[PDB]
C-alpha cells in the first residue's frame, strides 16, 4: 500500500493488486486525484474516462503530446488514459460506499493515499524471431485508495 | 579535523572503509601527502602516558555474574562499573543492588 | 546412533509390532503401587487424565486410538465446530496418563506371566 | 539456410522405442541400441557411459 490505515473509524479503502496494467499511467492517474477530495476526484476520473479532458502528466515524460489541455499546474504535456482509469474509479466507489458504512461524510472526504507499489515480477513470455524468447512481463500495480475523516 | 577513509570509497560501494595498506606501486598517501588524508603511522595516535576515559578518567570493571562481586571499588571504578548484558536480568538486578549500593555511579539504573 | 533424525527414523517407519508399544503413556501412581509396571500401551475405552498441560488434572476418556498417526482423540476435552458439533479432539498420548487398566481374559496373565 | 525445415520432412522413420529400457535409437533398419541392447547378448552395461 504505502500509507497506514490511520484509524479504522476514519479509514475506508479498497485494494487492487497484482494487475496486468501500465505502470506509469496508474500512479499518474493517482496524482490528479490524491490530495483532492472525493467529489472532485470522481468527477476528474469520469471526465478522462469519457471524452472531455486529459490528465496532464508531470512525473513521467516520454513521447507524449503537448496541447492546450495541459493545464493542471503550469504544465504543457498530457495524455488521456482509459482502461487504467476504470480500475481506479472502482476504488473511489468502494471506499466511498464503506465510508457511509462507518457513518462519515463519504463524498466530501479527503483522499489521503493513493499511489502504486511494485516489487516481484509476474513472469509472462512471448516469442520473437530466430528461435527466440524475450521478456513479456507485467507490472503489478498495487493500487489502493484511502479516505480519511474530513 | 581531517577524517580518514579507505580510498575509492567515494567512487563505488565495493570498498571496505577501514584502513588497508597501500599495497603495490603508487598512491598519493604512499609517497606521503597531507591533503587527501594521510597514511596512518605511529607518529599519529595517542601517546605512551595515557589510556582509558570517562568524564573522570575512570576505568571499568565488568562484574557479570555472581562469580567475583567483592572486587569492585569506588575509586578508579566510580563512574564506569558495569555488569554484563548476556548474563540474565535476574543476575543483573542482584549485582546492581550490591554494586551501585557501594557508593558509585553506574550508567544503567 | 547419537543422531536426531536417524533416531527418529526408527520411530517413524516402525513396524506394527513396535507401534503397539509406541502408543505409550505412563501409568498412575496407584497402578504402580498395585502392580509395579512403568507404562503400558494406550487403548480406546481407558479413562485418561492430562499430566503436563493447561488442561491440568482433568478427567477424560479416550475416543479413538490410531495406528500410524499415534495421536488419540480425548473425550471431555471437547470443543465444537464452526457448524456446531461437539467432537472429541486430538492430543498426543505423551501429554496423557491412563487411570484404567483392565483385567479381562489373560491380560491378567500378561502382567503376571513369568517375570512378574 | 539449409537446416530445420528440411529436417521437418522425415518420411523415413528411423527409430522407435525399446521394450526393456527406454533408449529410442532402436532402428527398424539397423536394430541397434546404445543402452542394454535390443536384441542383446548379455546386458550391455558399458563403462564409458559414466564420468562419476
Amino acid at each position: 500500500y504505502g500509507a497506514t490505515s490511520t484509524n479504522p473509524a476514519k479509514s475506508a479503502s479498497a485494494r487492487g493488486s497484482y494487475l496486468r496494467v501500465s505502470f506509469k499511467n496508474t500512479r499518474e492517474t493517482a496524482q490528479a486525484i490524491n490530495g483532492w477530495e472525493l467529489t472532485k476526484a470522481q468527477k476528474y476520473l469520469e471526465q478522462v474516462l469519457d471524452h472531455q479532458r486529459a490528465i496532464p502528466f508531470r512525473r513521467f515524460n516520454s513521447s507524449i503530446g503537448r496541447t492546450a489541455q495541459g493545464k493542471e499546474f503550469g504544465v504543457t504535456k498530457a495524455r488521456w488514459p482509459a482502461k487504467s482509469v476504470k480500475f481506479v474509479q472502482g476504488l473511489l466507489q468502494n471506499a466511498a460506499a464503506n465510508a457511509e458504512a462507518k457513518g462519515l461524510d463519504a463524498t466530501k472526504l479527503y483522499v489521503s493515499h493513493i499511489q502504486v507499489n511494485q516489487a516481484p515480477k509476474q513472469r509472462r513470455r512471448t516469442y520473437r524471431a530466430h528461435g527466440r524468447i524475450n521478456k513479456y512481463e507485467s507490472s503489478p500495480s498495487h493500487i489502493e485508495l484511502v479516505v480519511t475523516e474530513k | 579535523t581531517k577524517k580518514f577513509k579507505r580510498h575509492h570509497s567515494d567512487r563505488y560501494h565495493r570498498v571496505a572503509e577501514n584502513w588497508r595498506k597501500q599495497k603495490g606501486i603508487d598512491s598519493v598517501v604512499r609517497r606521503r601527502f597531507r591533503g587527501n588524508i594521510s597514511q596512518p603511522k605511529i607518529g599519529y595516535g595517542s601517546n605512551k602516558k595515557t589510556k582509558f576515559l570517562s568524564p573522570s578518567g575512570h576505568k571499568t570493571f565488568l562484574v557479570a555474574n555472581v562469580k567475583d562481586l567483592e572486587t569492585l571499588t569506588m575509586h578508579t571504578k566510580t563512574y564506569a562499573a558495569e555488569i554484563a548484558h548476556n548474563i540474565s536480568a535476574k543476575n543483573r538486578v542482584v549485582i546492581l543492588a550490591r554494586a551501585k549500593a557501594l557508593g558509585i555511579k553506574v550508567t544503567n539504573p | 546412533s547419537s543422531d536426531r533424525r536417524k533416531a527418529r527414523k526408527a520411530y517413524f517407519t516402525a513396524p506394527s509390532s513396535q507401534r503397539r508399544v509406541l502408543l505409550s503413556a505412563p501409568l498412575s501412581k496407584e497402578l504402580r503401587a498395585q502392580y509395579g509396571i512403568k507404562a503400558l500401551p494406550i487403548r480406546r475405552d481407558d479413562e485418561v487424565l492430562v499430566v503436563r498441560g493447561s488442561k491440568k488434572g482433568q478427567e477424560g476418556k479416550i475416543s479413538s486410538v490410531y495406528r500410524l498417526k499415534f495421536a488419540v482423540q480425548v473425550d471431555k476435552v471437547t470443543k465444537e465446530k464452526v457448524n456446531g458439533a461437539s467432537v472429541p479432539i486430538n492430543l498426543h498420548p505423551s501429554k496423557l496418563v491412563i487411570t484404567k487398566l483392565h483385567l479381562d481374559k489373560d491380560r491378567k496373565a500378561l502382567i503376571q506371566r513369568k517375570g512378574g | 539456410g539449409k537446416g530445420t525445415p528440411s529436417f521437418g520432412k522425415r518420411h523415413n522413420k528411423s527409430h522407435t522405442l525399446c521394450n526393456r529400457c527406454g533408449r529410442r535409437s532402436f532402428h527398424v533398419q539397423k536394430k541397434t541400441c546404445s543402452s542394454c541392447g535390443y536384441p542383446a547378448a548379455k546386458t550391455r552395461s558399458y563403462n564409458w557411459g559414466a564420468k562419476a
Partner: protein, 205 residues
Amino acid sequence: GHQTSAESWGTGRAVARIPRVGGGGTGRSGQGAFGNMCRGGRMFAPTKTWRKWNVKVNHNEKRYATASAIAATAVASLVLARGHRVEKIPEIPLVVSTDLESIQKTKEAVAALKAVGAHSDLLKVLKSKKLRAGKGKYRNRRWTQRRGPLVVYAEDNGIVKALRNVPGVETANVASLNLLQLAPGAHLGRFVIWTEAAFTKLDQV
C-alpha cells in the same frame, strides 16, 4: 563434482569460456570437478582421507610425561588451581588402603570420599552441560562426565566399576594410567586417589 558436464563455448551465446552450462548444468558447474570460484563445481582444498592426522611420539617421553604430570599432583597448588579441587591440602596425592576394593555401590563411594577429604573435587558440578556448536550439537558430546578425582587400582586388569559411577570421577589402573587421565586439556595437576598396593606398584620409575 564430476556429476555434471559443462563445456567452454565463449561469445556468440550467453555463457563464458568458464564451464558453467554445457551438457546439463543448472547450478552444477565444471567439466569434471572444476571451478572452485564457480558455485557447485569443486573446492580449493577438497579434504581427503589420504592426508595425515596420526603422528609419532617417543615411548621414553610417555613414561616421563605421566611421571611429570603426577609430580604436578604432588605439589598441591597445581591441583587446586586448574579445575580440580581438594579440601585436604597436605599429603597429596592421596593414598587410601586396599579397602577401596571393598566398596560395592556409589552410595558408599561418595560417603568414603566425604570422610577422607576428596569431596570438593566430587561436588563441583551443579548444573549439567547442554550442547555446543558444530559436531558438539550433533552427536555424543551432550552430557559429559567431569574429570574430577582419579581412582587408581593395584592388582591389575579388572579395575573398580564402583568408582566409575561416582558423579565426576574416573577409574584406572596403576599400569594403565595414561596421559589424558593425569593432564586432561593441556595443563597439569589432577587429583589422584591411590590404594596401598597401587602406590607400591608405582615404585618403579
